[PDB]
């Protein structure tokens, strides 16, 4: 009983554990289609600089 | 001589009378202490899994 409820636990663990991964990655400021363009040209724009 | 060894034989089975009143005491010992585990088990290790 012990055996298999402990198999049950660790999975969802684990699922819980990828889930909050995924969740901060999809989170980051940088995937955001609405990041407003910066006012300051960015320093490894080259292009701009130049 | 047969007077002989049945006295022989009587003291034979005498020791193993004592040797099984010990056995069935630790034995009664061991079947009490087996339910206790029992119990201390199911307290320590399968009562929490609910509210992980």
């Known amino acids: 009983v012990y055996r298999e409820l402990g198999s049950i636990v660790q999975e969802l663990k684990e699922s819980g554990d990828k889930l909050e991964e995924r969740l901060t990655m999809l989170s980051d400021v940088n995937l955001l289609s609405a990041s407003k363009p910066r006012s300051n040209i960015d320093s490894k724009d080259l292009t701009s600089h130049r | ?52």
Do not use: F, M, T
């Open chain 2, 1 to 52: 001589q047969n007077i002989q060894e049945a006295c022989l034989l009587l003291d034979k089975k005498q020791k193993h009378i004592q040797i099984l009143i010990k056995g069935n005491s630790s034995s009664k010992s061991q079947i009490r202490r087996s339910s206790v585990e029992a119990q201390k088990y199911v307290q320590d290790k399968l009562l929490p899994w609910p509210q992980e």
